Amino acid sequence: SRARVYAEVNSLRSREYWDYEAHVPSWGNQDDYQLVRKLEVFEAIRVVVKILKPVKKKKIKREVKILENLRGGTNIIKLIDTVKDPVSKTPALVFEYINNTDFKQLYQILTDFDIRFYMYELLKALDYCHSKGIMHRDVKPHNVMIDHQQKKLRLIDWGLAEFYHPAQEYNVRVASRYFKGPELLVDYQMYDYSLDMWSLGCMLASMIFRREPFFHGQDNYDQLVRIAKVLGTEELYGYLKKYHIDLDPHFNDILGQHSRKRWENFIHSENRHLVSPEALDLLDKLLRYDHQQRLTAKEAMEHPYFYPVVKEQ
Numbered sequence: 001s002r003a004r005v006y007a008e009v010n011s012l013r014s015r016e017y018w019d020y021e022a023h024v025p026s027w028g029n030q031d032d033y034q035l036v037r038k039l040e041v042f043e044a045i046r047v048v049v050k051i052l053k054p055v056k057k058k059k060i061k062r063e064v065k066i067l068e069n070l071r072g073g074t075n076i077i078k079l080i081d082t083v084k085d086p087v088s089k090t091p092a093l094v095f096e097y098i099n100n101t102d103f104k105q106l107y108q109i110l111t112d113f114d115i116r117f118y119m120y121e122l123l124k125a126l127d128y129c130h131s132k133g134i135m136h137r138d139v140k141p142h143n144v145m146i147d148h149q150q151k152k153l154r155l156i157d158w159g160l161a162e163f164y165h166p167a168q169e170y171n172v173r174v175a176s177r178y179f180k181g182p183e184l185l186v187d188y189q190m191y192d193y194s195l196d197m198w199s200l201g202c203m204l205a206s207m208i209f210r211r212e213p214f215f216h217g218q219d220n221y222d223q224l225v226r227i228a229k230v231l232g233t234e235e236l237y238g239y240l241k242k243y244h245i246d247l248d249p250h251f252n253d254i255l256g257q258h259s260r261k262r263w264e265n266f267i268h269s270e271n272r273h274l275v276s277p278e279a280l281d282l283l284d285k286l287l288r289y290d291h292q293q294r295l296t297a298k299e300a301m302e303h304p305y306f307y308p309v310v311k312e313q
């Protein structure tokens, strides 16, 4: 399997780009930054300070190299410095301050324009990083930072983000349960930037249908079952057949007969305004079992759904 876009990007670049094992950060004095408040992560002297956890050294390079690569990115959060504590020789990331407004409080008040705006802003981010050979693997509304007064956005926490090298197999052990795409739930390693487009999409469902999460699996197997109830099982099975995927025996007695529903099955009085058939066209093109069948980040910014947002640019 391969990416429809940006697939060579890293290959055409100096090894130094994407070989993070070879990265050597300069760690600075965290005494430049004092605890003000806690979010883990803290606010400080403004900034936000991330204390890297009991994590292997290799995992840390990957997140610094990637943040430097994406420095100067549209709607991508930015790194002011990487530091350590004098007494505590533990590594630390320090980011620009965005004045957050927790998505659970801010989603319920969104207008059918707010949604496309903030989704457009997300796609600006995802496409930019997809164009640098990096894939996020952790797009949830938690990692989507918004300032509704400022109407700014930042995609955050690149703790999990990996460089894309074609035909490379990746850990299927990433992302949050609700925003995991089918590739992760059926143990398929040869995934790419499409994953984030499932993530994003999943969030689209939530924003216009106000069912948050949209796919609320109660375990990791159920998370695929929950998806088969919308998208249908036959279309699922064909997807597995195509990529010659071994289906774990536990899925045997928990899928069965399921039908492609109508994305309109999810409209009701409370969400009526927020749905437009342009939302329901993009959305379909975004939530497809087959990672390759899915919209790219670019093709998405082109969907009609955003014609109202491009107009006021």
Ligand SMILES: O=C1C=C2C[C@]3(O)COc4c(ccc(O)c4O)C3=C2C=C1O
Pocket (backbone or CB within 6 Å): 039, 041, 048, 050, 095, 096, 097, 098, 099, 100, 145, 156, 157, 158, 159
């Ligand atoms: O891994 C993380 C995790 C967070 C959690 C979180 O604290 C959310 O809230 C934030 C923020 C950063 C700046 C900011 O201004 C803000 O409000 C966050 C992060 C950045 C990261 O890289």
Ligand SMILES: [Cl-]
Pocket (backbone or CB within 6 Å): 160, 162, 171, 174
């Ligand atoms: Cl990983």
